[PDB]
């Protein structure tokens, strides 16, 4: 056989910086939770329900074996919620000054939910740049154009 499935070689799943002080990735193996201690990571937020067919038995071990805070907030794919974005800035507002990951599988959550704190936090970051792991499907999936659009509706830059 030829090389098979390179981006095994290529570190952590979709990972994009956002901030100095914020990752945004898809889903990191064990191996990788230590990783992301060694970069600083103090804080890992998983979006990633734990029912998805993909998700670690017990994540929250791994994150804290690894010496990191665990912050849980499944988000369903298929029923994006105000509350769950709510939840994720009360999450970042608990860990201020903190290095943070925010994941799910393949950064298509995390990397909208950086985007929407970053923009309620008055940083103005640029849509088309963090929410690179989207591609052109946003408007594939309207669920997520609606719930971008709403939070996007209480703020300015
Ligand atoms: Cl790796
Ligand atoms: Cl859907
Ligand atoms: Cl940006």
Wanted: hydrophobic share 40%; with cysteine; charged share 20%.
């Amino acid at each position: 056989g030829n090389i098979e499935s390179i981006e095994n070689l290529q570190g952590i799943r979709a990972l994009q910086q956002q901030a100095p002080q914020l990752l945004s990735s898809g889903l990191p193996n064990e191996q990788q939770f230590s990783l992301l201690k060694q970069a600083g990571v103090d804080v890992v937020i998983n979006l990633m329900p734990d029912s998805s067919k993909d998700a670690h038995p017990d994540e929250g071990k791994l994150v804290t074996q690894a010496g990191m805070d665990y912050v849980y907030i499944p988000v369903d794919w298929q029923n994006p919620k105000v509350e769950d974005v709510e939840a994720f800035f009360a999450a970042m507002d608990q860990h201020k000054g903190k290095d943070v990951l925010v994941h799910c599988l393949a950064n298509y959550r995390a990397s909208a939910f950086a985007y929407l704190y970053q923009l309620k936090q008055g940083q103005n970051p640029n849509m088309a740049q963090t929410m690179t792991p989207w591609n052109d499907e946003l408007a594939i999936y309207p669920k997520w154009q609606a719930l971008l659009t709403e939070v996007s509706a209480k703020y300015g830059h």
